[PDB]
Design a protein around this ligand. Structure first.
Ligand code: B12
Ligand code: B12
Ligand SMILES: CC[C@H]1O[C@@H](n2cnc3c(N)ncnc32)[C@H](O)[C@@H]1O
Ligand SMILES: CC[C@H]1O[C@@H](n2cnc3c(N)ncnc32)[C@H](O)[C@@H]1O
Ligand SMILES: [N+]
Ligand SMILES: [N+]
Lengths: 253, 453, 453, 252
């Protein structure tokens, strides 16, 4: 019969032939997103499982080069700014340029952003655009609300185009921010490309801050940690960061 | 030492050893990003010749990072056997390459000769080796370690069960474990990359891993690839200790980027000796991969191949049970396509085996790189012929959490039956008892996770 | 049959079987040049699914060239065992791939199954196979032939000594022969591509080869890769006959471009049985390779993978001693880089072993192609694990007259000692009696052509 | 010190403990093939591998180098090209190289003779060094031999980015009975001077198979010398006009 490789029926397909307990297989198949219980042809994967693998790869490769529309960020009321990177092609090959704000970038933040905030929220596409557009409206409003109800001096958000994680150190120095929160898209997986991550550092400094000084919250999407549920833990994290005056491995517990 | 040579009437002059080591590398996107790559094929060949004519002493006395400035350089230099070094200090890199490749050089000859090498010398040999040189040379340099399984015996091929999950769900992790055990994967380790880096989450993952181990009396070991400090804390508090893992970098600055002190690895060795459920004497696990030092801005003008060798020189000091490069884990900015990921995978494995560590490889790629799953199947077979100690295993190689593709459970069983390789002998006996494997081949009832219920 | 599928909610329509076969191929520069490749990675997967669900009858009844218009098609169709066809005529291409890969499918099972196949069906299975599929599938399909050496036995690995010269200088040809034998190359054939195509020159080249064979009593066979007409005439006039060679194409128009008729191959078969110095029953030799049909304008809109499989259905009729694709002999317009050449090598060998022919491979590349010698070393080892019957052999792989690079003499010795493979059993005894090989490994005095003096 | 492109490096004997070292010298000088380089186990020796990679770096540069326009005027030839525009397109479109461009047909029927008996066409093909090195040694005697006791000689011209089957279109535009094509073969590892000669009797774009052509290959200093070559093409050319055939359709 006809079958779409991207369909839910295909994703729940069981290819084990003559199984010991097929009821357990269905139990295991719904227990994980991993491509389990697809069977085998000798020691090789089965045809359909391979076909669904190659289909997802064609979709996953397209998410790499796609960019968030300049109109979408404007519709979110966000200030768009970019690193030294000009285009996506150069973004994949030059990580050092994605870690520095461009000349017009430094001056825009010093003009349109709140000086010396206690919590600064930065958002960048990173390596996944879907991780932004899909989860933004779900995580960001409760994030800003929790940091203000009842909170402190919150900087204004701004979108960083073609940005890497280390660029949040420059944003902390420029804006004098106490805590910089970066929501950035991770590299695209095979099955999904909606995975968002959070990198937070206390009072960053480009010269001394090592990578271990950041706290990481990964797999923020519908298939992992819910964005609204994630929004609350980032809020609490920002609290504890300001009380302890430390981040990453430097925090207790 | 000479830093120049004439090629086709044109003179090719180089600044120091560090530039010679870099321009001798095969073309890769990482050396270009670092600004140390050769400008053409001609300059690359000229750098190889100048390198091949340099002696072991020329490279041993010129580490990419100075002794008094870097604790990894000191560790490498301090562990050198000076008697083995003085025997080969005047050997050119060309003669050391031919010495390693010689059929008249036995495994016991290399056992003493490698003690006189430094990582820079190990990297030097790999740079003037072809792909087949890297494969055949590594095959004749087996490295055997023992935990609850023996790994690295010629004729055997192991695999790490990697059951990762987007939320560290113990139902998702256990489901991937039964799937991998049904293909004969897990004799290297059952290792989980944890989403959250907290003690209580680690103990839950370890209890799930060892709950399966204790139920079927599996000869293997569990591990959660969190930071080494949190692993130490969990095991001290009563978590089942098997292998202790840490990611390593080839420079002190790179280790500080990961938040790693050398005392932590010393503590990991001491914690394993007091708490870990290991029969053998090897209980540590390290992962490497070209591009980590450059990513941390800690390469100090050195190429990623030379810096990767320094990882192996670091790891050898702690005699771990397993080390594997994660060859294509990062992205195209360090290794762009199939050609470069394969070449780096062969170099890494060769350098690891020449350093005397239980060298495996995570044959893998990312979706923003110019690669597909056929690359993983090409490299996993070449490295198997090279005697690679182990690869990874995931359902179809799809990591739902780390967002990359590694090798499948099918792939280990494929390699074993294609090349007539067996698992670790302890693990092979267990699979035979479970009816999963007979004469190294999957039985008819294999590949079925419902067999464990 | 369906010429349509839905992928992620997108309907992909295909005109006929010929388009599905082409667009199901992995990306290669030849299909782009032919205007038959898929437009996107999504359409390629869509073509694979449509192809996977088609039945054996759907592809058997829709060859790329009509029966009444192509003698190669008639030859492929007339040789099909109809009983073996009726058993599988309703199997999908998905089910045939799983049948081949199954460990419960024995060699004798395939021996009868493959008789119900056509070349188009053989190509169809390879299109939906990954690289490891093509390697593991070909490995479990050994083809054993016998001339004066036995080739194709699992656990063995042969090699063609290819001593080509710019002027057919016999001193240069003999020098390369002694060099090849000193490495254990020559159990497949000692075959020279000639410069001038005349009876007198072929006999001079043949007397040179057989002078070496007769002087040392070498169990092997010589050959001159000229046109089959001039080979037949030379042997009829008294030249020593070993293997009779002919370059083949997968279409009647392609054969005409090569100036070959099917009756010529019939005459070569009869001339070999009457004159040739062959102990076994196989004496013919064919060379193939993707792009030859499109180069002749004789592909008729079919992709180069399907056209290459037709070479094997044509070669199978004449039961030759050896066949090998010359994977990267032509240029980058048909196979661009390392990825494509490796893929084509695994495809060709798998399709050859599936077609029941003694399939080898000239792991090679050209200098205007995006490739180097590290590519040949990657492919030769992948194909060795696939059970490839033989590769070529030249001093370091440098062909001084054909302007390309194949595999070195060192490479066959490397592959044999790396994978614990032996030469042809008859040739191995000669190497042992010559002091060149002990226990499948080169002796200390091996690799020295002056040993024959 | 050692230059890998030197004659001393080409004559290097790497066999460690030879049976007869005097024989190894004899065998090495008897061929251009890279024999007698020894081994390190079953692997090539370091110097031999270095000279391999060094020769390859040079060979890759001989693929993309092009004959200068100042060199073709010093020989007095018509600058005509096919549909290909640059070298990168020529390596991937062999179909466009087998057909002339639009402004090409208008320069052949205008600046050449009508219905010649022998037509000499020259193209760079896949190697430039194959043309420049042997040009002055093969062309002067080729044109002189075809007019010394010869017949109607055509006008020579240079086709840029050309293939072999492009002479079928020339054989009809000019209407020649025999068309002679000197084209550069793809570069070898050790050299790129190798030249070939593709000749056909009365080509026809609709019916000429590649088997109807006669090929004289490996024309260079290491193979067939250009002066000796030039003489054997003129003989070839006389035999085509007599037997009214070419390639496999000939006798002898
Ligand atoms: C690739 C990768 C790495 C690479 C980073 C190199 C690079 N990306 O250029 C390397 C190999 C160095 C690495 C090492 C580690 N990683 Co990591 N890594 C990833 C991965 C798969 C991708 C991250 C990503 O896509 N970021 C988005 C891109 C656009 O940002 P980027 O600026 O290009 O990359 C930066 C970050 O990736 C960052 N980074 C990468 N890993 C980690 C881990 C931590 C704790 C921190 C603070 C930062 C960090 O380093 C890069 C800049 O230097 C994630 C998995 C995931 N689902 O995200 C895990 C992940 C982030 N890593 C993780 C871990 C455990 C580690 C290590 C602590 C391992 C160890 N035991 O030492 C180290 C620590 C790194 C450090 N310097 O402190 C965990 C984090 C768990 C947590 N909640 O703290 C994750 C979530 C995966 C996992 N579960 O194992 N990692
Ligand atoms: C690659 C190659 C082929 C390829 C051509 C595919 C392609 N080039 O796209 C294929 C696989 C078809 C091939 C097969 C054969 N080849 Co061939 N081929 C070559 C090679 C190595 C390169 C030619 C080249 O670089 N030309 C320059 C480029 C710019 O021209 P091109 O238009 O791109 O190439 C065309 C011609 O080369 C032609 N062609 C290729 N080979 C032959 C052989 C003959 C006799 C003819 C008339 C034409 C021809 O086909 C191409 C497309 O039109 C030469 C070796 C050399 N030193 O030149 C041998 C060579 C030309 N081939 C030769 C031989 C023996 C053959 C065969 C006769 C083998 C056989 N027994 O059937 C067939 C002939 C097929 C034919 N009639 O076209 C001989 C010719 C000997 C002679 N006395 O004429 C040569 C010289 C090598 C040798 N063994 O000595 N070949
Ligand atoms: C969360 C990234 C995981 O992948 C591993 N890894 C990937 N690439 C490298 C690399 N280049 N060096 C060291 N470790 C690496 C790392 O140990 C960690 O467990
Ligand atoms: C002078 C070309 C030589 O290489 C062989 N060859 C190279 N590529 C191919 C190919 N694609 N098909 C058939 N034969 C081929 C051919 O048999 C001839 O002996
Ligand atoms: N590294
Ligand atoms: N072909």
């Amino acid at each position: 019969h006809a079958l779409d490789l991207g369909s839910a029926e295909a994703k729940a397909w069981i290819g084990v032939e003559n199984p010991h307990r097929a009821d357990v297989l269905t139990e295991l198949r719904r227990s994980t997103v991993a491509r389990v219980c697809t069977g085998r042809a000798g020691p090789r994967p089965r045809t359909q499982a391979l076909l669904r693998f190659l289909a997802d790869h064609s979709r996953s490769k397209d998410t790499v080069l796609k960019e968030v529309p300049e109109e979408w960020v404007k519709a979110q009321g966000l200030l768009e700014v970019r690193s030294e990177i000009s285009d996506k092609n150069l973004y994949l090959t030059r990580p050092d340029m994605g870690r520095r704000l461009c000349a017009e970038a430094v001056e825009a933040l010093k003009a349109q952003c709140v000086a010396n905030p206690d919590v600064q929220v930065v958002i960048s596409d990173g390596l996944s655009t879907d991780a932004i557009t899909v989860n933004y409206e779900e995580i960001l409003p409760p994030l800003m609300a929790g940091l203000k109800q009842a909170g402190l001096k919150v900087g204004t958000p701004f979108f960083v185009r073609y940005g890497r994680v280390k660029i949040e150190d420059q944003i902390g120095e420029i804006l004098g921010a106490k805590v910089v929160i970066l929501l950035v898209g991770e590299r695209p997986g095979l099955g999904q490309s909606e995975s968002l991550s959070c990198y937070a550092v206390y009072s960053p400094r480009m010269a001394t801050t090592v990578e271990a000084d950041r706290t990481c919250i990964s797999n923020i999407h519908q298939g992992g940690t819910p964005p609204v549920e994630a929004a609350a833990v980032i809020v609490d994290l920002a609290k504890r960061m300001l009380e302890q005056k430390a981040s990453g491995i430097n925090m207790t517990r | 030492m000479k830093l120049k040579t004439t090629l086709f009437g044109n003179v090719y002059q180089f600044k120091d050893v560090k530039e010679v080591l870099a321009k001798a590398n095969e073309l890769r996107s990482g050396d270009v990003l670092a600004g140390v790559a050769a400008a053409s094929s001609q300059e690359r060949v000229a750098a190889k010749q100048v390198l091949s004519e340099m002696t072991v002493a020329d490279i041993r006395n010129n580490p990419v990072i100075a002794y008094e400035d870097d604790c990894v350089t000191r560790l490498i230099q301090d562990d050198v056997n000076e008697t083995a070094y003085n025997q080969i200090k005047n050997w050119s890199i060309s003669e050391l390459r031919e010495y390693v490749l010689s059929d008249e050089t036995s495994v016991d000859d290399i056992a003493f000769t490698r003690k006189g090498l430094t990582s820079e010398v190990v990297a030097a040999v790999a740079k003037i080796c072809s792909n087949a040189d890297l494969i055949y040379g590594a095959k004749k340099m087996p490295v055997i370690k023992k935990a609850n399984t023996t790994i690295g015996i010629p004729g055997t091929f192991s695999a790490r069960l990697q059951p990762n999950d987007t939320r560290d769900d113990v139902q998702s992790i256990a489901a991937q474990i039964y799937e991998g055990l049904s293909f004969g994967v897990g004799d290297a380790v059952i290792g989980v990359n944890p989403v959250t880096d907290d003690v209580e989450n680690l103990s839950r993952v370890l209890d799930t891993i060892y709950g399966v181990i204790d139920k079927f009396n599996i000869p293997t070991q569990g591990c959660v690839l969190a930071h080494v400090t949190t692993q130490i804390e969990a095991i001290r508090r009563g978590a089942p200790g098997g292998l202790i893992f840490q990611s390593i970098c080839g420079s002190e600055k790179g280790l500080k980027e990961f938040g790693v002190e050398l005392a932590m690895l010393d503590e990991a060795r001491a914690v394993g000796a007091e708490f870990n459920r290991i029969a053998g004497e090897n209980c540590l696990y390290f992962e490497t991969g070209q591009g980590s030092a450059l990513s941390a801005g800690a390469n100090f003008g050195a190429d990623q191949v030379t810096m990767e060798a320094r990882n192996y020189g670091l790891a050898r000091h702690y005699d771990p049970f397993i080390v594997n490069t994660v060859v294509g884990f990062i992205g195209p900015e360090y290794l762009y396509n199939d050609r470069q990921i394969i070449r780096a995978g062969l170099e890494d494995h060769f350098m690891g085996k020449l350093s005397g560590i239980s060298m495996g490889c995570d044959c893998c790629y990312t979706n923003h790189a110019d690669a597909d799953q056929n690359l993983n199947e090409n490299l996993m077979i070449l490295l198997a012929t090279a005697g690679c100690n182990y690869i990874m295993g995931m359902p179809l190689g799809d990591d739902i959490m780390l967002n990359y593709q590694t090798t499948a459970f099918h792939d280990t069983a494929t390699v074993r039956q294609l090349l007539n390789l067996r698992p670790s002998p302890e693990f092979e006996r267990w699979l035979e008892s479970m009816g999963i494997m007979a004469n190294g081949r999957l039985t008819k009832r294999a590949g079925d996770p419902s067999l464990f219920f």
